[PDB]
Design a protein around this ligand. Structure first.
Ligand code: MG
Lengths: 268, 52, 134, 56, 88, 235, 342, 88, 73
RNA sequence: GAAUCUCUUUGCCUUUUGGCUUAGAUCAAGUGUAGUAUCUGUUCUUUGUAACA
RNA sequence: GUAUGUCUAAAGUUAGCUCUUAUUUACUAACAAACUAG
């Protein structure tokens, strides 16, 4: 009746949770004065797990009214869990790239761990040049701009105009930018909310070309704050790749601007 | 007096709660953009001197 | 007038005998299977030990309630309200010799806890046994 | 008929309704009314500052 | 000290402190303000002045008067008035 | 018809308040269950309505002279970085765009790019039938506290109490009848199942102390037997 | 009579010990060092089991790696190198007690039978059995030949933190989170003497290597026990020190005591005097919570001191051979009357 | 305050309750101590402890009665009261 | 609420009270049955040219940034 | 002057959030019949006296 | 449609409001135009 289960590769996560959780609760019960545990012992650890999600989301774990040493011990234990988590992500990555027996679920877990680490490095890399820098000196920037003015005037380059209300090749640029978009949606069957919504936007753009061109040129004039970009991080087993799922209203006018900028760069 | 453990991701017992319980720069950008404006002025001073 | 307090107030508003001895035996079977089920899975909720022992005080069989408080002391002997309620339990049934054995145990277990001492001093105050309090 | 019901209940949502454009223009008109109130109060403040500076 | 460590009595203490300051003074005034109308009084005494006035406003009938006085001692005045209105 | 293809509708007041009563229950990251309440909108647009209009921690109030004179210096410094200026001001991005455009100085069928920032259409008692249905379904789902296993356990415990009171009803009929039949005991689910009426459930009599005992065990047994006779006659 | 006891303490004086300063930092591990063990014969090496599952065998004289023993999959909690065997018993929280044959550097024996995670080993130094105990509140003794749980030791309530074995009964001096230092009878399987003077989890019991005594450490009270009867010898000073992780006892009666607050506290073991209180500096990028000293040991000679901290570092502490009794006298000997600890 | 002081104050309260209210034999072999305890004192202690338990019971029901920010069921309004008490 | 954290461990007293069944396991077969004992001009046209440790954080480390620049392309 | 009852405040939390991972994962492309639930429309209502046992 | 769960005398233990009524909407169905489950 005392079948006790040894920790195989299904129970690194759960038994490591019980390990770290018992360690943290013994640390708080050591630290806290004269408190008999009935209910509070169950709940302080929730802050711990809150902090771990705050570490996974890279949100600063600021809880108002927490004591100083409890915040310290929770930060250092989630840093311990972070060290084991990151080293396990490295071990799984060079387990995939060796080409050995890697589980499918461990591959999806490794996708998730590596995209959390990638966006964490991305947030720190944005946040450093927010805090100090930026890395380009003003003299470098002026020499860059000076040699670009020198090149674009040595080539007598006239600037690309804004596309007028009555641009000549305009509906052909539009049907190219929409055939670029329906090339994704010609063969697939499974359609979520955003793909179905943007396919309805393409069908509505085919139903009205002139309202679409006025919508696009109005957005190029006036709109300067845009709906955010989801990333999804598809897997190639040597290296993951960022996949930027842009908003459905934005990709029509951005594909139009891509077509227009490439055509007006190659004409000039 | 430890706070009573409200978080965003997991509401285990389905409690609703008060909404607030759920939820500068280096100088160098001033060094860049000003200088770029300066270079742009020089560009507009040079090219318009050649357009006469 | 569709503000969030109205929605949450209305979702709060939307959310809302014994005859024979053998029938009371079946009542005790149902209720003891209930409380031993919720004490077999969790042996550390001391309020549950408290209220199942207080249930068996309400069923007036005292050796059962004494066994339940003693198993509750076997789990966590340091929990003071368990001690105070078992002492007051044996005092409500007007059994002070049992309570004196109990509080001598509560003293020899936890000497550095004040309330066990002071409650035993209270019991020997209102019993007016002064040489004992000496 | 199906596509007509689709073009009804889609384009009731993702169009600026005439009542919705009326409410948005009414909020912009109240913003312009508050801005005109502050501009007229600033003009009265400048005239009062000149009058009381030459007067006190 | 009295002003700090000490309602009527407190007021009296404050008054005394003010008197002393009048007779370091600025520092005393600041202290009084911190402890506690007082702000307005301080501003008046001062009459930096603008800043004081603003402070008084933040912490209103007499405030308006103070602001007016400050203005007297045009655009700035107007701005102040606007601010007051907003506050109201 | 249910065409739920495009979802970028103008935010009414009832969807605004249902999102405010949803983020309180669910939270800032669980947006599919927030968009399950709103029958018209997405989860991305609900999250945008949150982070641009319904999050109270960022400021919508009018800017000081200091903030205008530093936002012009930022819009010269960081030219078209309006999310970055929004982070520096801790203010909504489109609000700071509107303030910059006011410092320097859309027809009916046109699809609104930015509807989730501006305002919310008030409903002065004119609750639509669509709004009544969607609001009633939302306040049905905010009540969904217990899981379906807890729901079926409340159901099963209700069935136990109903079967138990029906069994006692049948026994009281047969006992007024005179047919002496006792109650079933519940089945031994496992071979060492404990029945808690025959014995002490676990005999843990207290450790023997220095005081004499039996004179109050007699009082206990006498009072317990009088309670047994009283349950025999009253219950 | 209390005034007589305080006056008799103030009559006596403590022994001077040489002040400890840091001499070597080893920054090898990708995780926290949880226990440090040193070979009780050669002093050629010491092995530090860490949270990155990889025990590493470091070198005393040079500070080099030589090998890495990575047979566990979970956090290696305790490491105990045998004295009369070429073995290395490595409790992890894999629920596995693994034996490492040091003539081979291979796993040879896997002691199954634990009901939860294990926290500590204790090789009984003059028999062929090891004492493993952990979260499951029960010490399993293990015959090293047959890998059988020979004698279960029933009686601790909460998880058991540190188990020490002596060659004479009490042959298992264990301690748990129920604040009890139990002295065990290995024959009878019964607690001969239950020591309930601590308040919180006793994370640390250390053997004195030249007298028959065990120091045990709760938060802000470290207490020395005479194992002949189970009597308190000295309640150490230990005011406001913090959560004590590990103890270690020099041959020359110097008692280390690592705190979770980053503080060290070297104690004169005879007198109970606290004389030196270090502040372990964190690494250049650590959090402030990673100053904690998780584990420690001495040299066999005692002139070194090894600590594994939670900043993924291993620090070596040595005495000042240039300081005298008048140069660095340590902290002052003044027993406190407000505490009853004197 | 603290559990020691609170035990002390409850002892003083129960002595005040007595102030508002107001041999030993052994065998040879068994050695159990028979203490003569007067029946009026026994059931007076019993009625006093039942009166204290019922007094605390009715005062706790009085605290249970009060209902006056955002909640779905009863446990939720208790938790929101707890968060309102954390906000100081 | 059917899934819960751990309050305390399954104590080994409960495993010491059970009487054993003889199940000869695949690993408790006799092996390593001996205990070992110890002894006792072309570049002047351009605009640039020569003519003109360790930290404790693992995510913020040098190796982890080398890793993420190796494996996201 | 000794004390009971009722309130107010403070303190104790009193039915008082009891794990983890890839936020664990992904989100209608009909109809008819039926069931359940809710809205809206529609109609009705507002005692003395005498005799005998 | 599974897992799985639950019920099942042959054998006898001694004395504004209340209402009818229809449209709409929401969730469900191995129910229909030979086969699909954790
Ligand atoms: Mg399954």
């Amino acid at each position: 009746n005392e079948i006790v289960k040894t920790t195989t590769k299904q129970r690194l996560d759960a038994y490591y949770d019980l390990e770290l959780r018992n360690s943290v609760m013994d640390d708080i019960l050591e630290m806290m004065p004269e408190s008999i545990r009935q209910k509070k012992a169950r709940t302080i650890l929730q802050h711990l797990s809150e902090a771990w999600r705050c570490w996974k989301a890279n949100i600063p774990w600021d809880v108002p009214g927490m004591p100083a040493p409890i915040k310290k011990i929770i930060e250092r234990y989630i840093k311990s869990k972070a060290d084991a988590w990151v080293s396990a992500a490295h071990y799984n990555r060079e387990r995939i790239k060796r080409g050995a027996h890697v589980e499918k679920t461990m591959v999806k877990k490794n996708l998730g761990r590596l995209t959390r680490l990638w966006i964490k490095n991305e947030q720190e890399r944005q946040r450093q040049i927010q805090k100090n820098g930026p890395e380009i000196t003003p003299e470098e920037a002026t020499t860059i701009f000076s040699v670009m003015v020198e090149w674009l005037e040595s080539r007598s380059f006239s600037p690309i105009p804004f596309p007028p209300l009555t641009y000549k090749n305009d509906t052909k640029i539009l049907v190219l930018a929409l055939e670029d978009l329906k090339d994704v949606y010609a063969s697939k069957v499974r359609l979520n909310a955003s793909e179905r919504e943007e396919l309805a936007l393409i069908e509505e753009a085919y139903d009205n070309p002139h309202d679409t061109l006025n919508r696009i040129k109005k957005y190029l004039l006036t709109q300067r704050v845009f709906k955010p970009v989801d990333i999804t991080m598809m897997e190639n087993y040597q290296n993951i790749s960022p996949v930027y799922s842009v908003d459905p209203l934005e990709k029509i006018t951005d594909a139009y601007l891509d077509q227009y900028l490439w055509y007006e760069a190659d004409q000039r | 007096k430890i706070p009573a453990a409200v978080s965003n991701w997991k509401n285990p017992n389905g409690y609703t709660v008060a909404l607030e319980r759920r939820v500068t720069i280096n100088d160098g950008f001033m060094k860049l953009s000003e200088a770029l404006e300066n270079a742009d002025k020089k560009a507009r001073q040079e090219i318009r001197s050649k357009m006469e | 007038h569709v503000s969030a307090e109205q929605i949450l107030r209305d979702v709060y508003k939307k959310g809302q005998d014994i005859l024979d001895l053998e029938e009371l035996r079946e009542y005790q079977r149902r209720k003891r299977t209930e409380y031993e089920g919720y004490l077999k899975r969790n042996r550390l909720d001391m309020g549950q030990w408290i209220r199942y022992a207080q249930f068996e005080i309400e069923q007036h069989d005292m050796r059962r309630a004494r066994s339940i408080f003693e198993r509750a002391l076997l789990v966590d002997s340091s929990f003071i309200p368990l001690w105070i309620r078992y002492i007051d339990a044996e005092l409500k049934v007007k059994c002070i010799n049992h309570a004196r054995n109990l509080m001598n145990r509560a003293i020899s277990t936890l000497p550095r806890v004040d309330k066990l001492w002071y409650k035993y001093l209270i019991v020997e105050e209102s019993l007016n046994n002064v040489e004992i309090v000496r | 008929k199906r596509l007509a019901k689709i073009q009804q209940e889609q384009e009731d949502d993702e169009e600026l309704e005439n009542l919705r454009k009326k409410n948005l223009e009414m909020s912009q008109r109240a913003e312009m009314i508050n801005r005109s109130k502050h501009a007229q109060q600033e003009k009265a403040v400048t005239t009062d500052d000149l009058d009381n500076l030459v007067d006190q | 000290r009295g002003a700090v460590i000490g309602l009527e009595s407190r007021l009296q203490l404050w008054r005394m402190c003010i008197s002393k300051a009048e007779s370091v003074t600025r520092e005393l005034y600041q202290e009084c303000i911190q402890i506690l109308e007082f702000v307005i009084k301080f501003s008046d005494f001062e009459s930096r002045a603008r800043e004081i006035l603003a402070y008084g406003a933040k912490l209103n009938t007499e405030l308006w008067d103070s602001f007016e006085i400050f203005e007297l001692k045009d655009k700035e005045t107007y701005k102040d008035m606007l601010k007051m209105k907003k506050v109201l | 018809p249910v065409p739920i293809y495009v979802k970028g509708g103008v935010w009414t007041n009832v969807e605004d308040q249902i999102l405010k009563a949803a983020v309180q229950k669910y939270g800032t990251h669980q947006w599919s269950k927030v968009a399950s309440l709103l029958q018209k909108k997405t989860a991305r647009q609900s999250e945008l309505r949150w982070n641009e209009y319904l999050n109270p921690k960022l400021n919508f109030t009018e800017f000081s002279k200091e903030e205008d004179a530093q936002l012009l210096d930022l819009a010269r410094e960081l030219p078209n970085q309006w999310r970055t200026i929004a982070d520096m001001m801790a203010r909504p991005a489109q609000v700071c765009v509107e303030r910059y455009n006011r410092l320097l100085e859309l027809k009916v069928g046109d699809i609104n790019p930015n509807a989730e920032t501006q305002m919310a259409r008030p409903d002065n008692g004119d609750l639509e039938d669509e709004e009544k249905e969607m609001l009633a379904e939302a306040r049905a789902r905010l009540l969904n506290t217990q899981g379906k296993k807890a729901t079926r356990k409340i159901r099963e415990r209700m069935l136990e109490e109903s079967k138990r009171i029906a069994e006692l009803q049948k026994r009281r009929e047969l006992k007024q009848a005179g047919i002496n039949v006792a109650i079933k005991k519940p089945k031994k689910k496992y071979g060492t199942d404990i029945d808690y009426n025959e014995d002490i459930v676990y005999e843990q009599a207290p450790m023997p102390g220095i005081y004499d005992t039996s004179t109050e065990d007699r009082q206990i047994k006498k009072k317990f037997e009088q309670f047994e006779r009283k349950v025999n006659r009253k219950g | 009579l209390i005034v007589n006891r305080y006056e008799k303490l103030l009559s006596q004086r403590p022994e001077w010990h040489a002040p400890w300063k840091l001499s070597r930092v080893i920054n090898g591990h990708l995780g926290w060092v949880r226990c440090v063990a040193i070979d009780p014969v050669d002093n050629e090496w010491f092995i530090t089991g860490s949270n990155d599952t990889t025990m590493k065998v470091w070198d005393l004289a040079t500070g080099k790696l030589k090998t890495t023993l990575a047979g566990h999959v979970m956090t290696v909690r305790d490491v105990a190198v045998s004295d009369r065997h070429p073995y290395l018993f490595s409790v992890s929280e894999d629920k596995t007690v693994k034996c490492w044959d040091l003539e081979k550097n291979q796993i040879i024996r896997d002691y199954y039978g634990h009901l939860s995670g294990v926290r500590t080993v204790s090789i009984h130094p003059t028999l062929d059995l090891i004492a493993t105990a952990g979260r499951d509140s029960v010490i399993k003794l293990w015959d090293m030949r047959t890998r059988i749980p020979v004698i279960t030791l029933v009686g601790h309530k909460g998880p058991i933190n540190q188990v020490q074995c002596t060659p004479v009964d009490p042959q298992v001096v264990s301690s748990s989170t129920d604040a009890t230092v139990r002295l065990w009878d290995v024959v009878a399987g019964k607690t001969m003497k239950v020591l309930t003077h601590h308040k919180r989890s006793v994370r640390a019991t250390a053997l004195h290597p030249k007298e028959f005594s065990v120091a045990s450490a709760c938060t802000d009270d470290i207490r020395s026990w005479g194992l002949a009867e189970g009597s308190l010898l000295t309640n150490f000073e230990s005011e406001k020190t913090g959560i004590i992780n590990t103890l270690s006892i020099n041959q020359d009666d110097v008692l280390f005591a690592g705190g979770d607050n980053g503080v060290l506290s070297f104690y004169d073991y005879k007198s109970g005097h606290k004389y030196q209180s270090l502040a372990t500096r964190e690494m250049v990028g650590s959090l402030e919570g990673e100053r904690s000293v998780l584990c420690s040991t001495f040299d066999k000679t005692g002139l070194r001191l090894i600590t594994g901290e939670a900043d993924k570092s291993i620090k070596i502490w040595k005495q000042d051979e240039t300081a005298t009794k008048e140069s660095e006298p340590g902290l002052a000997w003044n027993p406190n009357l407000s505490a009853k600890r004197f | 305050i603290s559990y020691d002081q609170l035990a002390k104050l409850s002892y003083e309260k129960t002595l005040r309750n007595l102030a508002t209210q107001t041999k030993v034999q052994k065998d040879t072999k068994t050695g159990k101590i028979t203490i003569a305890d007067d029946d009026k004192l026994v059931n007076k202690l019993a009625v006093s402890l039942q009166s204290e338990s019922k007094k605390r019971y009715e005062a706790r029901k009085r605290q249970m009665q009060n209902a006056k920010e955002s909640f779905i069921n009863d446990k939720n309004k208790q938790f929101n009261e707890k968060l309102s008490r954390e906000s100081k | 609420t059917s899934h819960r954290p751990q309050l305390e461990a399954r104590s080994g007293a409960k495993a010491a009270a059970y009487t054993p069944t003889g199940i000869e396991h695949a690993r408790l077969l006799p092996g390593h049955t001996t205990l070992k004992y110890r002894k006792f001009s072309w570049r002047k046209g351009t605009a640039f040219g020569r003519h003109k440790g360790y930290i404790n954080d693992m995510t913020k480390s040098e190796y982890h940034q080398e890793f993420l620049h190796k494996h996201v392309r």
